[PDB]
Coordinates of C-alpha atoms in Angstrom, one line a residue:
Chain R
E627 CA -8.7 22.7 -1.8
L628 CA -10.3 20.1 0.8
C629 CA -8.7 19.6 4.3
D630 CA -8.5 16.0 5.6
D631 CA -7.5 16.8 9.1
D632 CA -10.1 17.9 11.9
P633 CA -10.0 20.9 14.0
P634 CA -7.6 20.6 16.9
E635 CA -8.6 20.5 20.6
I636 CA -7.4 23.0 23.3
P637 CA -7.7 22.0 26.9
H638 CA -10.8 24.5 27.9
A639 CA -12.1 26.2 25.0
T640 CA -14.9 26.3 22.1
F641 CA -14.5 26.5 18.3
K642 CA -17.0 27.6 15.9
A643 CA -17.3 29.3 12.3
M644 CA -19.5 31.9 10.7
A645 CA -18.0 32.5 7.1
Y646 CA -18.1 29.5 4.9
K647 CA -15.8 29.4 2.1
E648 CA -17.2 28.3 -1.4
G649 CA -16.4 24.3 -1.3
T650 CA -17.9 23.7 2.4
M651 CA -20.2 20.7 2.2
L652 CA -23.1 19.5 4.6
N653 CA -24.8 16.3 4.8
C654 CA -28.2 16.1 5.9
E655 CA -29.2 13.4 8.3
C656 CA -32.6 13.7 10.4
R657 CA -35.4 10.4 8.7
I658 CA -33.7 10.6 5.3
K659 CA -35.4 9.0 2.1
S660 CA -35.2 11.7 -0.9
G661 CA -33.1 11.7 -3.9
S662 CA -30.6 14.1 -2.5
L663 CA -26.8 14.0 -1.4
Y664 CA -25.0 17.0 0.1
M665 CA -25.7 20.7 0.5
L666 CA -22.8 22.7 -1.4
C667 CA -22.1 26.4 -0.9
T668 CA -21.5 27.9 -4.4
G669 CA -21.1 31.3 -6.0
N670 CA -19.1 34.1 -7.7
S671 CA -17.9 37.4 -6.5
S672 CA -21.4 38.7 -6.5
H673 CA -23.2 36.4 -3.8
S674 CA -23.3 32.7 -3.0
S675 CA -25.8 30.2 -2.3
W676 CA -26.6 26.6 -1.0
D677 CA -27.5 24.3 -3.9
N678 CA -29.2 21.1 -2.8
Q679 CA -31.9 21.6 0.2
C680 CA -33.1 18.6 2.0
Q681 CA -36.2 16.9 2.8
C682 CA -37.3 14.0 5.4
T683 CA -40.1 11.6 5.7
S684 CA -41.1 9.2 8.4
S685 CA -40.3 5.4 9.4
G686 CA -16.6 35.8 -0.5
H687 CA -18.3 33.5 2.0
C688 CA -21.9 32.1 2.6
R689 CA -23.9 32.2 5.6
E690 CA -25.3 29.4 7.6
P691 CA -28.3 27.8 6.0
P692 CA -31.9 27.9 7.8
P693 CA -32.8 24.9 10.1
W694 CA -34.7 22.0 8.1
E695 CA -37.4 19.7 9.7
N696 CA -35.3 16.9 11.7
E697 CA -31.9 18.1 12.8
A698 CA -29.7 16.2 14.8
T699 CA -27.7 17.6 17.8
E700 CA -24.7 17.6 15.8
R701 CA -24.0 18.6 12.1
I702 CA -20.9 18.0 10.5
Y703 CA -19.1 20.2 8.1
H704 CA -16.5 19.3 5.3
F705 CA -14.2 22.2 5.3
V706 CA -11.7 23.6 2.5
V707 CA -8.1 24.9 2.6
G708 CA -8.4 28.6 3.7
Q709 CA -11.0 28.0 6.3
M710 CA -10.8 29.5 9.7
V711 CA -12.6 28.6 13.0
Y712 CA -12.6 30.8 16.2
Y713 CA -11.3 29.2 19.6
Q714 CA -15.6 28.7 32.1
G715 CA -12.3 30.4 32.5
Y716 CA -10.1 33.2 31.7
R717 CA -6.9 33.5 29.4
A718 CA -4.0 35.9 29.3
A719 CA -6.5 32.6 19.2
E720 CA -7.6 31.3 15.7
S721 CA -7.2 28.0 13.8
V722 CA -6.5 28.0 10.3
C723 CA -6.2 25.2 7.7
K724 CA -2.9 25.2 5.4
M725 CA -1.5 23.0 2.7
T726 CA 2.7 22.9 1.8
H727 CA 4.0 19.8 0.8
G728 CA 0.9 18.3 -0.3
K729 CA -0.1 17.8 3.4
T730 CA -2.9 19.6 5.1
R731 CA -3.3 20.4 8.8
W732 CA -4.9 22.9 11.3
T733 CA -2.3 25.4 12.7
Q734 CA -2.3 24.9 16.6
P735 CA -4.1 28.0 17.8
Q736 CA -1.6 29.4 20.4
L737 CA -4.1 30.3 23.0
Chain T
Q1106 CA 10.0 4.5 8.3
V1107 CA 6.2 4.7 8.0
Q1108 CA 4.9 1.4 6.9
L1109 CA 1.4 -0.2 6.4
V1110 CA 1.3 -3.9 5.9
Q1111 CA -2.0 -5.6 4.9
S1112 CA -3.5 -9.1 5.4
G1113 CA -3.3 -12.0 2.5
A1114 CA -5.2 -12.7 -0.3
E1115 CA -8.5 -14.4 0.0
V1116 CA -10.9 -16.6 -1.9
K1117 CA -14.7 -16.2 -1.1
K1118 CA -17.8 -18.1 -2.1
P1119 CA -20.6 -16.0 -3.2
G1120 CA -23.1 -14.4 -0.5
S1121 CA -20.3 -14.7 2.0
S1122 CA -18.2 -12.0 4.1
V1123 CA -14.7 -11.3 4.5
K1124 CA -12.7 -9.0 6.8
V1125 CA -9.2 -7.0 5.8
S1126 CA -6.6 -5.7 8.1
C1127 CA -4.1 -3.0 7.7
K1128 CA -1.4 -2.6 10.5
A1129 CA 0.3 0.6 10.9
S1130 CA 4.0 1.9 12.1
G1131 CA 6.3 4.9 11.9
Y1132 CA 4.0 7.7 13.1
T1133 CA 1.2 8.2 15.8
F1134 CA -1.9 6.2 15.1
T1135 CA -4.9 8.3 16.0
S1136 CA -3.7 11.7 14.2
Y1137 CA -4.6 10.7 10.8
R1138 CA -7.4 9.4 9.0
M1139 CA -7.0 6.0 7.0
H1140 CA -8.4 5.7 3.4
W1141 CA -9.4 2.6 1.4
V1142 CA -9.4 2.2 -2.4
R1143 CA -10.0 -0.7 -4.9
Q1144 CA -8.5 -1.4 -8.4
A1145 CA -10.8 -3.9 -10.6
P1146 CA -9.0 -5.7 -13.3
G1147 CA -8.9 -3.3 -16.4
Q1148 CA -11.0 -1.0 -15.0
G1149 CA -9.4 2.6 -13.1
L1150 CA -9.2 3.8 -9.6
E1151 CA -12.1 3.9 -7.1
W1152 CA -12.4 5.7 -3.6
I1153 CA -14.5 4.0 -1.4
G1154 CA -14.5 5.9 2.3
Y1155 CA -12.5 6.8 5.2
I1156 CA -12.6 6.7 9.2
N1157 CA -11.1 8.9 12.2
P1158 CA -9.7 6.5 14.6
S1159 CA -10.1 9.6 17.5
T1160 CA -14.0 9.6 16.9
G1161 CA -15.2 6.5 14.8
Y1162 CA -16.8 8.6 12.3
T1163 CA -17.2 7.3 8.8
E1164 CA -17.8 8.8 5.3
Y1165 CA -18.7 7.1 2.1
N1166 CA -19.4 7.7 -1.5
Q1167 CA -22.8 7.0 -3.1
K1168 CA -21.6 3.5 -4.4
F1169 CA -20.5 1.4 -1.7
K1170 CA -22.8 2.9 1.0
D1171 CA -24.6 -0.4 2.0
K1172 CA -21.6 -2.7 0.9
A1173 CA -18.3 -1.7 3.0
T1174 CA -17.9 -0.9 6.8
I1175 CA -14.5 0.9 7.8
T1176 CA -13.6 0.2 11.4
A1177 CA -10.6 0.6 13.5
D1178 CA -8.9 0.3 17.1
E1179 CA -6.2 2.5 18.5
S1180 CA -5.2 -0.4 21.4
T1181 CA -3.5 -2.6 18.5
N1182 CA -2.9 0.1 15.6
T1183 CA -4.9 -1.2 12.8
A1184 CA -7.7 -0.4 10.6
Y1185 CA -10.4 -2.7 9.2
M1186 CA -12.6 -3.2 6.1
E1187 CA -15.5 -5.6 5.8
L1188 CA -17.2 -6.7 2.6
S1189 CA -20.9 -7.5 3.0
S1190 CA -22.7 -9.9 0.3
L1191 CA -20.1 -11.3 -2.3
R1192 CA -20.8 -10.9 -5.7
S1193 CA -18.4 -11.7 -8.8
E1194 CA -18.1 -8.0 -9.7
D1195 CA -16.5 -7.3 -6.5
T1196 CA -13.2 -9.1 -7.4
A1197 CA -10.2 -6.7 -7.2
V1198 CA -7.0 -5.4 -5.2
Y1199 CA -8.0 -3.6 -2.1
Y1200 CA -5.3 -1.1 -0.8
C1201 CA -5.3 1.3 2.7
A1202 CA -3.9 4.6 2.1
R1203 CA -3.0 6.8 5.0
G1204 CA -4.8 10.4 5.0
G1205 CA -3.6 14.0 6.0
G1206 CA -3.7 15.4 2.4
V1207 CA -2.7 13.9 -1.2
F1208 CA -2.2 10.1 -1.1
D1209 CA 1.5 9.1 -0.4
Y1210 CA 2.0 6.2 1.6
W1211 CA -0.1 3.1 0.6
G1212 CA -0.2 -0.6 1.5
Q1213 CA 1.0 -3.8 -0.1
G1214 CA -2.6 -4.5 -1.4
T1215 CA -4.9 -7.4 -0.8
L1216 CA -6.5 -9.7 -3.6
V1217 CA -10.0 -10.8 -3.0
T1218 CA -11.4 -13.4 -5.6
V1219 CA -15.1 -14.2 -5.6
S1220 CA -16.7 -17.3 -7.4
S1221 CA -18.7 -20.4 -6.7
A1222 CA -16.1 -23.1 -7.8
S1223 CA -13.6 -24.9 -5.7
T1224 CA -10.0 -26.3 -5.6
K1225 CA -9.6 -28.5 -8.7
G1226 CA -6.3 -29.9 -10.4
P1227 CA -5.0 -29.3 -13.9
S1228 CA -5.1 -31.6 -16.9
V1229 CA -1.7 -31.6 -19.3
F1230 CA -1.9 -32.2 -23.1
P1231 CA 1.2 -31.9 -25.1
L1232 CA 1.4 -29.8 -28.6
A1233 CA 3.5 -31.8 -31.1
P1234 CA 5.7 -30.1 -33.4
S1235 CA 9.5 -32.0 -38.9
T1236 CA 13.1 -33.0 -38.4
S1237 CA 14.4 -31.8 -42.0
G1238 CA 14.9 -27.8 -42.6
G1239 CA 13.7 -24.9 -41.0
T1240 CA 12.5 -23.9 -37.2
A1241 CA 9.8 -25.9 -35.5
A1242 CA 7.6 -25.1 -32.2
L1243 CA 6.2 -27.1 -29.4
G1244 CA 4.8 -26.9 -25.8
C1245 CA 2.2 -27.9 -23.0
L1246 CA -1.5 -27.2 -22.7
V1247 CA -2.6 -26.9 -18.8
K1248 CA -6.6 -26.8 -18.7
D1249 CA -9.6 -26.8 -16.1
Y1250 CA -7.8 -25.7 -12.7
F1251 CA -9.2 -23.2 -9.9
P1252 CA -7.7 -21.1 -8.4
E1253 CA -4.3 -19.5 -9.6
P1254 CA -1.6 -19.5 -9.8
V1255 CA 0.6 -22.3 -11.6
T1256 CA 4.3 -22.6 -12.5
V1257 CA 5.5 -24.2 -15.7
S1258 CA 9.4 -25.3 -16.4
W1259 CA 11.4 -27.0 -19.0
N1260 CA 14.0 -29.6 -18.3
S1261 CA 14.2 -28.3 -14.3
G1262 CA 15.1 -25.0 -15.5
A1263 CA 17.9 -26.0 -17.8
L1264 CA 16.8 -24.1 -20.8
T1265 CA 15.0 -20.6 -21.1
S1266 CA 15.9 -19.9 -24.8
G1267 CA 12.7 -19.0 -26.7
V1268 CA 10.2 -19.7 -24.1
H1269 CA 7.0 -18.2 -23.8
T1270 CA 4.3 -18.8 -21.0
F1271 CA 1.0 -16.8 -21.5
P1272 CA -1.4 -15.7 -19.0
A1273 CA -4.4 -17.7 -17.7
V1274 CA -7.9 -17.1 -19.3
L1275 CA -11.2 -17.4 -17.5
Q1276 CA -13.9 -19.8 -19.4
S1277 CA -17.5 -19.5 -19.3
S1278 CA -17.2 -22.6 -17.2
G1279 CA -15.6 -20.5 -14.6
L1280 CA -12.0 -22.3 -14.2
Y1281 CA -8.6 -21.4 -15.6
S1282 CA -6.6 -22.5 -18.6
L1283 CA -3.0 -21.6 -20.2
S1284 CA -0.4 -22.9 -22.6
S1285 CA 3.2 -22.9 -22.6
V1286 CA 5.5 -22.9 -25.6
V1287 CA 9.0 -23.0 -26.9
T1288 CA 10.9 -22.8 -30.4
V1289 CA 13.6 -25.0 -31.3
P1290 CA 16.0 -26.5 -34.3
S1291 CA 14.4 -29.3 -36.2
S1292 CA 17.7 -31.0 -36.5
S1293 CA 17.1 -31.6 -32.5
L1294 CA 14.1 -33.5 -32.4
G1295 CA 15.9 -36.7 -33.3
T1296 CA 18.3 -36.4 -30.4
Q1297 CA 16.9 -34.3 -27.9
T1298 CA 14.2 -34.9 -25.0
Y1299 CA 11.7 -31.9 -23.9
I1300 CA 10.0 -32.1 -21.0
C1301 CA 7.4 -29.6 -19.2
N1302 CA 7.2 -29.3 -15.2
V1303 CA 3.9 -28.2 -14.0
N1304 CA 3.1 -27.3 -10.5
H1305 CA 0.0 -26.4 -8.4
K1306 CA 0.2 -25.8 -4.5
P1307 CA -3.2 -25.4 -3.8
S1308 CA -4.0 -29.0 -4.3
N1309 CA -0.3 -30.5 -4.1
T1310 CA -0.1 -31.8 -7.7
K1311 CA 3.3 -32.1 -9.5
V1312 CA 3.3 -33.7 -12.9
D1313 CA 5.8 -33.4 -16.0
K1314 CA 4.9 -34.3 -19.3
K1315 CA 7.5 -35.3 -22.1
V1316 CA 6.8 -34.1 -25.5
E1317 CA 8.1 -35.8 -28.9
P1318 CA 7.2 -35.9 -32.7
Chain E
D580 CA -19.6 13.2 -9.5
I581 CA -16.9 14.9 -11.2
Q582 CA -15.6 12.6 -13.8
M583 CA -12.2 12.9 -15.9
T584 CA -11.1 11.9 -19.6
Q585 CA -7.6 11.2 -20.3
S586 CA -5.9 11.1 -23.8
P587 CA -4.4 9.2 -25.7
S588 CA -5.1 6.2 -24.0
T589 CA -1.9 4.5 -25.1
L590 CA 1.3 6.2 -26.3
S591 CA 4.0 4.5 -28.4
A592 CA 7.4 6.3 -28.0
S593 CA 11.1 6.3 -27.8
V594 CA 13.9 7.0 -25.5
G595 CA 14.8 10.6 -26.1
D596 CA 11.2 11.8 -27.4
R597 CA 9.1 14.6 -25.4
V598 CA 5.9 13.5 -24.1
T599 CA 2.6 14.9 -23.2
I600 CA -0.8 13.6 -21.6
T601 CA -3.9 15.4 -20.9
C602 CA -6.9 15.1 -18.3
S603 CA -10.2 16.8 -19.0
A604 CA -12.4 17.7 -16.1
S605 CA -16.3 17.9 -16.4
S606 CA -16.1 20.8 -14.3
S607 CA -13.7 23.8 -13.2
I608 CA -11.3 22.7 -10.5
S609 CA -8.3 24.4 -8.6
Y610 CA -5.5 21.8 -8.6
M611 CA -4.7 18.4 -10.3
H612 CA -2.5 15.5 -9.0
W613 CA -0.5 12.7 -11.0
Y614 CA 0.6 9.2 -10.1
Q615 CA 3.0 6.6 -11.7
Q616 CA 2.0 2.7 -11.6
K617 CA 4.0 -0.4 -12.5
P618 CA 2.7 -3.8 -12.7
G619 CA 2.4 -5.6 -9.2
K620 CA 2.8 -2.1 -7.1
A621 CA 0.6 0.4 -5.7
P622 CA 0.5 3.9 -7.2
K623 CA 3.4 6.3 -6.3
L624 CA 2.8 10.1 -6.2
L625 CA 4.6 11.9 -9.1
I626 CA 3.5 15.3 -9.1
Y627 CA 1.5 17.1 -6.3
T628 CA -0.6 20.4 -6.8
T629 CA -0.4 20.7 -10.4
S630 CA 3.1 21.0 -10.8
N631 CA 5.4 20.3 -7.7
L632 CA 7.9 17.1 -8.0
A633 CA 7.8 14.8 -5.1
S634 CA 10.9 13.8 -3.3
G635 CA 12.9 11.2 -5.4
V636 CA 11.6 12.4 -8.8
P637 CA 14.0 13.5 -11.6
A638 CA 14.1 17.2 -13.0
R639 CA 12.6 16.2 -16.4
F640 CA 9.1 15.8 -15.0
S641 CA 6.3 18.7 -14.9
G642 CA 2.9 19.7 -15.4
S643 CA 0.4 22.6 -16.2
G644 CA -2.9 23.9 -16.8
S645 CA -6.2 25.7 -15.3
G646 CA -10.0 25.5 -15.3
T647 CA -10.8 22.1 -16.9
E648 CA -7.8 21.3 -19.1
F649 CA -4.6 20.3 -17.3
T650 CA -1.5 18.4 -18.7
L651 CA 1.9 17.0 -17.6
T652 CA 5.2 16.3 -19.8
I653 CA 8.6 14.7 -19.9
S654 CA 11.2 16.4 -21.7
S655 CA 13.3 13.4 -22.7
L656 CA 11.9 9.8 -22.1
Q657 CA 14.4 7.3 -20.0
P658 CA 14.1 3.6 -19.8
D659 CA 12.8 4.0 -16.3
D660 CA 9.9 6.2 -17.4
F661 CA 7.8 3.1 -18.9
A662 CA 4.6 2.8 -17.2
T663 CA 0.8 3.6 -16.8
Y664 CA -0.2 7.3 -15.4
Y665 CA -3.2 8.5 -13.7
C666 CA -4.8 12.1 -13.1
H667 CA -6.6 12.9 -9.6
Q668 CA -8.9 15.3 -8.5
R669 CA -9.9 16.5 -4.4
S670 CA -12.1 19.7 -4.6
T671 CA -15.3 17.8 -3.9
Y672 CA -16.7 14.5 -2.6
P673 CA -16.7 11.9 -4.1
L674 CA -12.9 11.5 -4.9
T675 CA -12.4 10.2 -8.3
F676 CA -9.3 9.3 -10.5
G677 CA -8.6 9.7 -14.2
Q678 CA -8.9 6.3 -16.6
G679 CA -5.3 5.8 -17.5
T680 CA -2.5 6.3 -20.0
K681 CA -0.2 3.9 -20.8
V682 CA 3.5 4.5 -22.6
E683 CA 4.8 1.3 -24.5
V684 CA 8.2 1.1 -26.2
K685 CA 8.1 2.2 -30.0
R686 CA 10.2 -0.5 -32.0
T687 CA 10.9 -1.4 -35.3
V688 CA 8.2 -3.2 -37.3
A689 CA 8.3 -6.9 -37.2
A690 CA 6.1 -9.5 -38.8
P691 CA 5.0 -12.7 -36.8
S692 CA 6.0 -16.5 -37.3
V693 CA 3.0 -18.6 -37.4
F694 CA 2.6 -22.1 -36.0
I695 CA -0.5 -24.5 -35.8
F696 CA -1.2 -27.3 -33.2
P697 CA -3.8 -30.2 -33.6
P698 CA -5.6 -31.7 -30.4
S699 CA -3.8 -34.1 -28.5
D700 CA -5.1 -37.9 -28.4
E701 CA -5.3 -37.9 -24.8
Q702 CA -7.4 -34.8 -25.0
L703 CA -9.7 -36.6 -27.6
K704 CA -10.8 -39.5 -24.9
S705 CA -12.2 -36.6 -22.7
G706 CA -15.0 -35.7 -25.4
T707 CA -13.6 -32.1 -26.1
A708 CA -10.5 -31.0 -28.2
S709 CA -8.6 -27.7 -28.7
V710 CA -6.6 -26.1 -31.4
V711 CA -4.0 -23.7 -31.0
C712 CA -2.4 -20.9 -33.3
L713 CA 0.9 -19.3 -32.1
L714 CA 2.2 -16.0 -33.1
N715 CA 5.8 -15.3 -32.5
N716 CA 7.6 -12.2 -31.5
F717 CA 5.9 -9.3 -33.3
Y718 CA 5.3 -5.5 -33.2
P719 CA 3.1 -3.3 -33.2
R720 CA 0.4 -5.0 -31.1
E721 CA -2.2 -4.9 -33.5
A722 CA -2.8 -8.6 -34.7
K723 CA -6.1 -10.1 -36.1
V724 CA -6.7 -13.6 -35.9
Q725 CA -9.6 -15.7 -37.7
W726 CA -10.4 -19.4 -37.8
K727 CA -11.5 -21.0 -41.1
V728 CA -13.3 -24.5 -41.1
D729 CA -13.5 -25.6 -44.7
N730 CA -13.2 -21.9 -46.0
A731 CA -16.0 -20.7 -43.4
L732 CA -16.3 -17.8 -41.2
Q733 CA -16.5 -18.7 -37.2
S734 CA -17.8 -16.9 -34.0
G735 CA -18.2 -17.3 -30.4
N736 CA -16.0 -20.2 -29.5
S737 CA -12.2 -18.5 -29.5
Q738 CA -10.3 -17.0 -26.7
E739 CA -7.1 -15.2 -27.4
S740 CA -4.4 -14.5 -24.7
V741 CA -1.5 -12.0 -25.0
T742 CA 2.0 -11.5 -23.2
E743 CA 3.3 -8.4 -21.9
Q744 CA 6.0 -6.5 -23.8
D745 CA 9.5 -8.5 -23.7
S746 CA 11.8 -6.2 -21.6
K747 CA 14.7 -7.1 -23.9
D748 CA 13.4 -7.0 -27.3
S749 CA 10.1 -5.1 -26.9
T750 CA 7.9 -7.6 -29.1
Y751 CA 4.8 -9.5 -28.4
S752 CA 3.6 -13.0 -28.4
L753 CA -0.3 -14.0 -28.8
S754 CA -2.1 -17.3 -28.7
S755 CA -5.3 -18.0 -29.9
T756 CA -7.2 -21.1 -28.9
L757 CA -10.5 -22.7 -30.6
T758 CA -12.5 -25.1 -28.3
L759 CA -15.4 -27.4 -29.6
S760 CA -16.7 -30.8 -29.2
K761 CA -15.7 -34.2 -30.3
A762 CA -18.8 -35.0 -32.6
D763 CA -18.8 -31.8 -34.5
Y764 CA -14.7 -31.8 -34.9
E765 CA -14.7 -35.1 -36.8
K766 CA -17.0 -33.4 -39.4
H767 CA -14.4 -31.4 -41.1
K768 CA -11.2 -31.8 -43.0
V769 CA -9.3 -28.4 -43.7
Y770 CA -8.7 -26.1 -40.9
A771 CA -7.1 -23.0 -41.3
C772 CA -5.4 -20.1 -39.2
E773 CA -5.4 -16.8 -41.2
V774 CA -3.4 -13.9 -39.8
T775 CA -3.2 -10.4 -41.0
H776 CA -0.4 -7.9 -39.7
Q777 CA 1.2 -4.6 -41.0
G778 CA 4.6 -6.2 -41.6
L779 CA 3.3 -8.7 -43.9
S780 CA 2.6 -7.9 -47.3
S781 CA -0.1 -10.5 -47.7
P782 CA -2.1 -12.4 -45.1
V783 CA -0.3 -15.8 -44.4
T784 CA -2.2 -19.2 -43.6
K785 CA -1.4 -22.4 -41.8
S786 CA -3.5 -25.5 -42.2
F787 CA -3.9 -29.0 -41.7
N788 CA -6.2 -32.0 -42.5
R789 CA -8.2 -33.7 -39.8
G790 CA -7.2 -37.5 -41.0
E791 CA -3.5 -37.4 -41.0

């Protein structure tokens, strides 16, 4: 349970996630120096938390964590199998990550 | 079908740097990540990291952070991996493996050997065997050479019966040594000639020693 | 880091036996993957997501498990099945592999022949001399070699070398080399190679006198 492929790109659209499945990872960037690694969503059926909070110096599902000290423009996530993301012009649509023959890929969200 | 071909073996001096290739075919290049893995002698398997040719983004593990840098280009369909400041502990076989799930398509492999020594020819000494009753043995000893490999033959590949050639062992001096042996009837030592044929390509050396009682 | 422990490390078995390897995870995991590797080749995927057979794999393979304890089986060993096996996890970073399990051919017990070699005279003008002791066509692999100099134990001067299991008679061969200098070699008379092995009722010895 860990997707290798990145989410696709539909000509004209935007994708985001709200519900993070247990497994999801984020690396803290800012600048970094502390003795830490990743932020890791962990939990049972009751609730779920984030394990390893981040600091910087000078020189079923879990919500998105509270902003820290020096975040960059973009924050990258490591998704898991099961994860779902949602996709200036009208349309007349959701991307899911699946695994069949030992192969993981995000299904093309038929817009 | 899908095939990934890697660059040849390399021998490097301590403190230097080397860059390894992996060319791809049988699929569309930018749709998949490429991973790298090394296998040290005796030791198991260890995962370095990956790259995505669409973005150029890399991820690593908390070991090879400041030791390796994955790189690629869509124009020529190849992925690269450079090693920074070489130590003897870095000696291993390096594989490129395609992403997209569980590992399935691997490359051939690339050897990187790191030591201070330089090209060196071998030195050949005989091992004398009793021409009455019982079974005897004899062989050649090949010592003080760098680097591998070296090939041994008997009487121009004429006899293969009861011939053993052992693996080379690294010495505290940092160069290589091995010995080849064969077992023969004692009633032959009178009227039979035995010659070992040692060869070393890196130095263009061809010497054949005759052994006798 | 999630690290894993395979067992056993080495398995000796016969064609037609049943086989079972085990991989122990430090934490609870969802799925386990397995590979096969032969000398000079890249790993080949064997069983994915804990039990599914890869294409080209024969019906006699399989696997099972959950939580922290996973395992793979072979119901009847064939000749092609002799190799090294690895477990693998991918539910968090970093990705980690198992240590390994080697499956060798179990044979009938065979005691070695032993042979002794004095250092060559051309070698003697170099100022350094080497002494060689040979162990011929034996099984099992467990063979202990110790050097004797006028009935005295020795240490930190010898290096042994082992061949790969002979693909035709399943035997092994070993080579223990004692390396010294010229001066200290011309100081002793009786040099002995004492060999111990299962198929030997009593430890056998080969010796020689320095001067003729």
